[PDB]
């Protein structure tokens, strides 16, 4: 009965640790990776991955989405 959720605009500005709990609550299979905002990455789509892009305070810098 989980609602289909693939983006988390509400997590912008939150800590990485707070973000991870919400994402796992919505998407138990998520493989979460943390990277500095602005990092260059490969552009393949991985349906179970969630990249978190963080600022220098380790707060979520942009909208987390699946892929």
């Amino acid at each position: 009965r989980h609602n289909l959720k693939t983006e988390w605009p509400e997590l912008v500005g939150k800590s990485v640790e707070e973000a991870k709990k919400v994402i796992l609550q919505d998407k138990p299979e998520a493989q979460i990776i943390v990277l500095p905002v602005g990092t260059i990455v490969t552009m393949e789509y991985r349906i179970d991955r969630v990249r978190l892009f963080v600022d220098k305070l380790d707060n979520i810098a942009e909208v987390p989405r699946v892929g």
Binding site: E7, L35, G38, T39, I40, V41, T42, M43, E44, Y45, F53, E62, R65, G67
Partner: protein, 433 residues
């Protein structure tokens, strides 16, 4: 790849025109390439066709434990089974994966990356990567633009996988002078909803406009469930699904991009061998755009750009190849003979001066396309609302006039230099009819 080949008409280019990319050299900057050794150990898709294999990210190690780069390069030019679009082109591979798993082998100034590839003979350069900066024009975007204007290298970038929301284009996919590629679906329907309609834009594909309101991506190609070369070092987890020990499935704008890169090699070969010219980057891009197919969403469009690559329509465009430099207030005027009963598509493209990373608009030199029909009806570039000559474009370095039901007679095709502060500015035109 085998299904994508038919979708983008690479099969028609090959079978009816003999275009497999022979004599062309494509550079791919990506993770690594199979074993990382240009010898008999190399994956069959690339063995014997590697012009250069450079290790940038890890000292003396260009191998591919991830699998991304090997799959990507397979889609450009793999010559075993599940072949790339230009399987007789040779490869320059720049391994940019660092020892921390990222792409830290990229140099701070991307012109360094392009220059190394250019020196090895590559005239096409393809990049299935980006920073997801939501339409920003970054220093990387600026360096791509500066490079393309200075050198006859066609550079392609993935649009990003940050859709379906608007304004999600990654950098350097936001560069004005790159060909930016988004993903439609491959037709492998046994896999379900991601590979069931060749007109569907992949849900993850980044969407325009750019931050300054430009149309990106430029063109689309299949980018879901693409079957291509599997690195001998990569685990199952790197792929969407398995196939065999040598080939597996992946999806992303990462996969659409190299398909188009291969098509560009086929197209470049055609001009060079059969049309008497070395086509400039702007012309290759204009020819792909004019020949592209509306997937059904119409133009203008932030989801499909200018449509899905349809290579056979691009091959024999009537053209201008940067042969008329313009300064402010000058113009170049041409004629084209149309016959009623079939569409007329005219694309103007220039490799603009590099834009500013802080200004409202990235466009520097502003050219306008002005078309006049045999009965006097006027159209200006990118004005798709009637009347078609009142909304002038001052943001894009791609301007199009697409007339579904043209008149018989002489069309005037005019390029006007509205404002060229960094001139002169050359341009290319491609006409499909």
């Amino acid at each position: 790849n085998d299904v994508a080949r038919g979708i983008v008409k690479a099969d028609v280019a090959q079978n009816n025109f003999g275009l497999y990319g022979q004599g062309q050299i494509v550079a791919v900057a990506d993770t690594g390439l199979d074993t990382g050794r240009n010898d008999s150990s190399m994956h069959e898709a690339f063995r014997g066709k590697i012009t250069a294999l450079y290790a940038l990210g890890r000292t003396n190690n260009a191998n591919d434990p991830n699998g991304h780069g090997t799959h990507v390069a397979g889609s450009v030019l793999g010559n075993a089974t599940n072949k790339g679009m230009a399987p007789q082109a040779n490869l320059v591979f720049q391994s940019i994966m660092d020892s921390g798993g990222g792409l830290g082998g990229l140099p701070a100034n991307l012109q360094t990356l392009f220059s190394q590839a250019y020196s090895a003979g590559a005239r096409i350069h393809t990049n299935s990567w980006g920073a997801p900066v939501n339409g920003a024009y970054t220093t990387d975007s600026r360096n791509v633009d500066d490079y393309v204007r200075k050198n006859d290298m066609t550079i392609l970038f993935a649009a990003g996988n940050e859709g379906p929301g608007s304004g999600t284009i990654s950098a350097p996919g936001t560069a004005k002078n790159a060909i930016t590629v988004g993903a439609t679906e491959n037709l492998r329907p046994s896999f379900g909803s991601y590979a069931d309609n060749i007109n569907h834009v992949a849900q993850f594909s980044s969407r325009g406009p750019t931050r300054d309101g430009r149309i990106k991506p430029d063109v689309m190609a299949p980018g879901t469930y693409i079957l291509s070369a599997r690195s001998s070092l990569a685990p199952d987890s790197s792929f969407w699904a398995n196939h065999d020990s040598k080939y597996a499935y992946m999806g992303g704008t990462s996969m659409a991009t190299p398909i188009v890169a291969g098509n560009v090699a086929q197209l470049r070969e055609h001009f060079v061998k059969n049309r008497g010219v070395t086509p400039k980057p702007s012309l290759l891009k204009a020819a792909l755009i004019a020949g592209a197919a509306d997937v059904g969403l119409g133009f203008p469009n932030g989801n499909q750009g200018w449509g899905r690559v349809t290579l056979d329509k691009s091959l024999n465009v009537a053209f201008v190849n940067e042969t008329s430099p313009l300064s402010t207030s000058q113009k170049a005027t041409y004629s084209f003979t149309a016959q009623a009963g079939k569409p007329l598509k005219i694309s103007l493209v220039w490799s603009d001066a590099p834009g500013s990373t802080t200004a409202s608009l990235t466009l520097v030199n502003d050219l306008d396309l002005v078309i006049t029909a045999p009965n006097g009806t006027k159209y200006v570039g990118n004005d798709f609302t009637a009347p078609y000559d009142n909304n002038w474009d001052g943001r894009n370095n791609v301007e199009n006039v697409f007339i579904n039901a043209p008149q018989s007679g002489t069309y005037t095709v005019e390029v006007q230099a509205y404002n060229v502060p960094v001139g002169p500015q050359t341009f290319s035109l491609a006409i499909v009819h």
